[PDB]
Design an enzyme around this catalytic site. Structure first.
Site, short mmCIF file in Angstrom:
data_model
loop_
_atom_site.label_atom_id
_atom_site.label_comp_id
_atom_site.label_asym_id
_atom_site.label_seq_id
_atom_site.Cartn_x
_atom_site.Cartn_y
_atom_site.Cartn_z
CG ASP B 41 -81.98 80.21 89.99
OD1 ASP B 41 -82.54 80.43 91.08
OD2 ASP B 41 -81.72 81.11 89.16
CG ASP B 43 -86.72 84.48 89.12
OD1 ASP B 43 -87.66 84.59 88.30
OD2 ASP B 43 -86.92 84.27 90.33
CB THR B 109 -87.63 79.86 92.99
OG1 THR B 109 -87.53 81.27 92.77
CG2 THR B 109 -88.91 79.56 93.75
N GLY B 110 -85.72 81.25 95.16
CA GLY B 110 -85.63 82.05 96.36
C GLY B 110 -86.80 83.02 96.44
MG MG Z 1 -81.48 83.10 89.36
#
Ligand code: MG
Ligand code: MG
Ligand code: MG
Ligand code: MG
Ligand code: NA
Lengths: 210, 209, 209, 208
Positions: B41, B43, B109-110
């Site tokens: 991931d 962040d 990542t989102g």
């Molecule tokens: Mg995160």
């Protein structure tokens, strides 16, 4: 470090360092009855997590050293906009509100170098909602070798308390015979190694790392 | 009264029932296995990017999280504001270990997708990732032209996924792979902090920095 | 509560606002001061005596604390059951330090007074206290034939008092002397555990054993 | 060194240990038929240091030689556990296994004596039903006894609880589940072992 499965034990889990921890409420209670006074606050890692700006400054001007800290170009960028990326500390909010209630005069004394212009005062006033009556322009004490630049300002403004994360913040308070209180430096700060809070027998504010 | 709550030895030694692991233990558990695909991931997992998100909020949505929908924000965040993001040491250790194994590193990542992004570059430079193990950042979401994090984990056949959020771990479980939790720093602006270990997953020690 | 509660770094680092001190700090604060009188509570301060209280309860009051009022219990408790009491290491360090200083050491207890007692000999032998610095255990109470803890602290002019209970600390405060808290072990049968530092007093680190 | 101080990285530092709770242990056994499980005694289910302490003071003030004195074991196994304090962590584990209908076995390294009241003390302190209770097993290296490992296999124990490293290696050698209990900081049996040194599960707050 070279042990795969170090394990642990209950004596180690409960082990405590001999530090004098205090809370904001305890500090406020110790100031009951006292009339308005001048108090000072360190800036970096005390009221602001400014590592973002110092990190970019390092990568930009001195990737493999700390010479950026002596570069006039770095300070120009840092004191005029990079604090837009600085994250305010919750512990600081609580202390500043508390002192604002008492009607205390708030000063900021930083080791940062002085520049022709600065927007740091504004960012501090806006982020912490400091009334014009309690706010004072930030004092850039700078940093000279073999000397503590904080002492002169603590004396002249007759500050009775000084909050800081560095040893030189605390020893400055001790030199002036005033109350030096330590704030914990975040673990993810780029300014390492972390100092040993309580190394001078001073009071340390709990959970002040954020 | 409650000015001095005090404490006691039971409270001092109390531990939460969490499965903690170190990077070395993880490495040791992979001994003998051939190179594989692993994902991270971004962040609060490999980068402390709260500075950019914090500025984004104060600049586009001072009183809410609407800035997360403002295309102007995402243009700034994915194209330069990560120069203010602090790399995590735990990530550095994990990435170096996977590089040594010759594994293929992926970053999911989102964050919203933008026509251009310099995050991939920032990641490869800060972690000195060889082009051989590097892969352009993957932006996942609910949009029609983009696949969800799960679909990306399956498509690339990732065997391990590192993350700080609950959705990072559940995605991993839904794919039958190993989900390992990274601790979110206490000064992150993305709150509240999640409960690391809430799914009985492994959690990397001292991974908050 | 919940099966997998998990945790976060804020909780892992959370500290109670307590004033911790070490034996080395206490000694340093006494540098230069002439020999004086100091006092120690006994149970859970210098001795882990729960084994005797546990057996007392089981033998005279399985369902209650009525054994604490049974003359038969105290006969055995003050005349031999302390042979099963385990001396605390924190206490040894404190006593050794006060012995080096030449201070007079007094032991004050809230245990019911019996016509005979072997506790004094047990303490002297366990902590190797020289005859000149040793004093017979003092049983404090409400009885008309005895004085309260406060009265004894004043009469002997004790400058410091160590204890694990709240009443030990308030007793020192009332006499205007320095009350120092010792942590009560988690396996003690005297529960619940008190809140060390509840009066802003100094608490000795790692003093649970 | 007078004022060592500290920092937040040190305050939040965790050892890489696999911690578990009684509830998680119970949950992992969901749906399994009743089975045999074993417990070490000293510092696992009972805080027996008071008796060991008196034994030491009486026969070996400056050493552990008392551990080999027959006079010590006669008193230790026939009454001194009346001063042994039951551990709450063990109480929860035992109740949990009793509810499942599992058979409880107690294996100890204490020297075997002609008579012993330890079995009685355990059954009463933990209120163990006759249907789940079994006489204390004294394992050892003597020709007339069986080793702990043999007893674990003999009774087909699937789980073994203990505070010492040898308790965990015994379970490992049998291919069963070894779970660590934390030894109390005030125990007289020092030094404290390193719980988790084998990557085994360790029960939280099991020091009392
Ligand atoms: Mg995160
Ligand atoms: Mg600073
Ligand atoms: Mg007491
Ligand atoms: Mg044992
Ligand atoms: Na400073």
């Amino acid at each position: 470090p070279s042990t795969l499965n170090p394990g642990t034990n209950v004596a180690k889990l409960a082990e405590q360092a001999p530090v004098h921890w205090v809370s904001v409420a305890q500090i406020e209670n110790s100031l009951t009855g006292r009339p308005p006074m001048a108090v000072g606050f360190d800036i970096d890692d005390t009221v602001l997590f400014s590592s973002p700006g110092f990190w970019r400054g390092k990568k930009t001007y001195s990737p493999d050293s700390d010479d950026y800290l002596k570069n006039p170009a770095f300070w120009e960028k840092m004191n005029n906009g990079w604090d837009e990326f600085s994250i305010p500390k919750e512990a600081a909010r609580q202390l500043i509100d508390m002192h604002v209630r008492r009607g205390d005069s708030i000063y900021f004394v930083t080791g940062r170098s002085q520049t022709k212009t600065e927007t740091v005062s504004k960012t501090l006033a806006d982020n912490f909602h400091i009334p014009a009556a309690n706010m004072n322009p930030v004092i850039f004490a700078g940093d000279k070798p073999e000397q503590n630049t904080n002492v002169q300002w603590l004396q002249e403004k007759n500050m009775r308390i000084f909050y800081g994360d560095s040893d030189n913040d605390i020893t400055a308070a001790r030199d002036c015979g005033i109350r030096g209180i330590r704030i914990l430096r975040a673990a993810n700060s780029t300014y390492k190694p972390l100092p040993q809070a309580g190394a001078f027998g001073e009071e340390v504010i709990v959970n002040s790392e954020y």
